[PDB]
Structures are given as C-alpha cells and as structure tokens.
Design a protein around this ligand. Structure first.
Ligand SMILES: *[C@@H]1O[C@H](CO)[C@@H](O)[C@H](O)[C@H]1NC(C)=O
Ligand SMILES: *[C@@H]1O[C@H](CO)[C@@H](O)[C@H](O)[C@H]1NC(C)=O
Ligand SMILES: *[C@@H]1O[C@H](CO)[C@@H](O)[C@H](O)[C@H]1NC(C)=O
Ligand SMILES: [Zn+2]
Lengths: 307, 53
C-alpha cells in the first residue's frame, strides 16, 4: 500500500484501510462487526490471531472513544501495522502471538469522529440526540455500567461529560459492552487509548480505593512508562485516575476491571498541553513509536505471568 | 420559536485541563420540534478549548 501512517485519516479512509489490511493479512487477521453507531455507521474490530492449537487469551485495545483525540485512532492503526508487518520475523511478536490474540477497535465513536472532520474539531461526545434534538451527544466514557453517574459525570445533556440517559444507554456502548462481557473470562488486558496528558492510568476514577492487584498494575505501568521515555525522553506519569487526573464514573477502564479483567489501563498520549488535542502530524510517528514501546512492555509483562 | 439567549453556564463545574476557562451556554436555531439546539462551550484567551481528556 501507499497508506501513510504518519498523517491523520478521515473515517472513509479508515474503513478502506480495515478492508485492505484484512485481505492482505488474511491468514492472521479478520474483521468483525460489533454493531452500528446512532447514525448507522458500522463499528468493527480487527482480530489478530496466529492460528494454532493453543487456547488464546485476549488483549483488547480500543481508540477514539472521544472524537477529538485524533492521535488515538492513529496509534491503533500504527499498532496493527507493526504487529502485521513483523508477525513472522520478529521473535517477540511471534512469542506474544503463540498465546495471545489481539482485538483492536480503531475508532469507537465513529459519529463524533466524522463530526470533528466535517464540523467541529473539538467535539468529544457521540452524536445521539437528546431532549427532542435540542442537544447532542453522550460522553461514551461515562456511559459504562461502573458506578454509573456517581461522580465526575453530568446528567445535563448539554455537558461534555453527560453520562447518558442510563447505564449502557448508547448503541456504541452496548456494542462494546455486550461483546466484552461475552469474552471477559479470556481477556487478560484492556487498553483504552486517549489524549492528551502523557499518563498511564489504572483504576479507579470513581473512588480513591485501589484494586486488589494495584501494586502489580503500577509496576507494569511504570516499566512501560520507562520504556516509553527511553525513546525520545517523553515523560509519563503512572497512577490511578482519581489520584493523578480527576474523578470520573462509568469509564470503560473501570468497568473492565470491575468485571474481573486483571489489567485495565487508560493511556493518555501526547502532548502535555502545548497543542492539546490538535497534535501536529509531524508528531504522529514519534508518538506512535514511543507508545509502541510502552504497549509491548505491558504485553511482555502480561505474557510472562502465564507463559 | 424562541431560541434561548446565550449566557454564562449555570454551575458549570471545573475545566480540569484549562482551570481558568469560561463556560458559555450557546444555542442556535435548528430544524427540530423546539427550533433550536444548545451546548456548553469553553473558551480561554479567545479560543475554544477542551476540558476533559
Ligand atoms: C448494571 O450492572 C449491574 C450488575 O453489577 C446490573 O445488575 C444492572 O442491571 C446493570 N445495568 C445495566 C443497564 O446493564
Ligand atoms: C472502598 O473500600 C472500602 C473497604 O476498604 C469499602 O467499604 C468501600 O465501599 C469502598 N468504596 C467504594 C466507592 O467502592
Ligand atoms: C418530544 O419527543 C417525544 C418523543 O419521545 C414526544 O412524545 C413529544 O411530543 C415531543 N415534543 C414535541 C413538542 O414535539
Ligand atoms: Zn478521552
């Protein structure tokens, strides 16, 4: 292909990329329908799996739950490309694929993401109408059934953190949650990619309580942050959302930990505020390369726990 | 339809990424049952900004 991973792509190009990458790597990748957005845009994930007789555990990664965070879908595509281009020759990727399958959701909030290209670059929420169309959008990362709407979320539909009309009320959330719920016993690690702030966040947002395996989570997280910084010197902070970012509820990260997935992280990618959400394309390649180091460090650690 | 006037947000809460930003309630005419559409807009130093990551 002549598909550049060093620029931002509108949704139509991502639909075509998923279809092309799936056929070119058909021996190890399949594309699966999860559901449709409010506006009937299809939501897919890519499953990377090297066929074998071993039972597989699952790594889940999703990007673009928040529409304006363009660096996150860029990284999901970078991740996929790196795995696929190196899954035969690279001993470390070949290792991971002997026992893990990767499920990657490149853009979850497709309606909002299209909206940021067509109309409003700083849109965050979905595009579902509320109050007879007088307001639009649910914050999909406040819509999961994890202490739903208890703190750090609004019941006001005009607010950027609107939690929705009820837990798992939006079609995007339903599609993710029902699927994840059906695989939960096999999912070892849940990664949700966001921007910006250069943080690696553990549960929880809705309490300052820590999960039962919090020491293990921040050891893995800090080693990943160290591996990331080694690349270009980018500084990341590791800790629970409530401690180092702000309180929230209904996040997919907390919901995943609550249903028993042992490693659940939110990554907040570049930068620290100079450009914010509108990260220049000149920073896509270095952001993705350093983030790749972090993610493979996590996957190495998760893997070493079992094989 | 009487489109509500733009005004400061009422009890807007924090803007964690830009703590001193200003929240405005902004409505525009729209083709729906009530004739308008509203949202909260955050601005700092003359530019719209995001508050949550
Ligand atoms: C939220 O989760 C609890 C289970 O812990 C469940 O009993 C309740 O029905 C759930 N609500 C939805 C809408 O899934
Ligand atoms: C925090 O943990 C304590 C037990 O250590 C528990 O009683 C409390 O309900 C927890 N808080 C939340 C919000 O889950
Ligand atoms: C607003 O929407 C509801 C549908 O949920 C409808 O019953 C109601 O009549 C609508 N109001 C107006 C003024 O159209
Ligand atoms: Zn986000």
């Amino acid at each position: 292909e002549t598909y550049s991973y060093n620029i931002y792509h509108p949704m139509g190009e991502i639909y075509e990329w998923m279809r092309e990458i799936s056929e070119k790597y058909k021996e190890v990748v399949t594309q699966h329908f999860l559901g449709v957005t409010y506006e009937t845009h299809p939501i897919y994930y890519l499953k990377i799996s090297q066929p074998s007789g071993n039972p597989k555990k699952i790594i889940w990664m999703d990007c673009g739950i928040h529409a304006r965070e363009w660096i996150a879908p860029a990284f999901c595509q970078w991740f996929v490309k790196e795995i696929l281009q190196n899954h035969k020759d690279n001993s470390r990727i070949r290792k991971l694929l002997r026992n893990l399958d990767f499920y990657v959701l490149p853009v979850l909030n497709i309606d909002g993401y299209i909206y940021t290209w067509t109309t409003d670059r700083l849109w965050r929420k979905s595009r579902s109408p509320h109050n007879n169309g007088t307001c639009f959008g649910t914050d999909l990362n406040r819509n999961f059934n994890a202490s739903w709407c208890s703190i750090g979320a609004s019941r006001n539909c005009q607010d950027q953190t609107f939690c929705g009309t009820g837990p798992v009320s939006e079609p995007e959330t339903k599609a993710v949650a029902s699927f994840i719920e059906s695989k939960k016993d096999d999912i070892l690690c849940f990664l949700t990619m966001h921007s910006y702030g250069q943080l690696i966040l553990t549960p929880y947002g809705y309490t300052k309580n820590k999960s039962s395996n919090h020491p293990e989570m921040i050891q893995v997280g800090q080693k990943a942050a160290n591996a990331l910084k080694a690349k270009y010197g980018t500084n990341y902070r590791v800790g629970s959302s409530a401690d180092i970012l702000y309180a929230s509820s209904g996040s997919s990260r907390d919901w995943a930990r609550d249903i028993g997935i042992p490693f659940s992280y939110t990554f907040e990618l570049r930068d620290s505020g100079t450009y914010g959400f509108v990260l220049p394309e000149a920073q896509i390649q270095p952001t993705c390369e350093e983030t790749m180091e972090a993610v493979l460090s996590v996957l190495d650690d998760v893997y070493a726990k079992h094989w | 339809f009487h489109v509500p006037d733009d005004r400061p947000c009422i009890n807007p809460g924090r803007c964690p990424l830009v703590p001193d930003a200003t929240c405005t309630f902004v409505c525009k005419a729209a083709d729906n049952d009530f004739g308008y559409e509203c949202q909260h807009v955050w601005t700092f130093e003359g530019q719209r900004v995001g508050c949550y990551a």
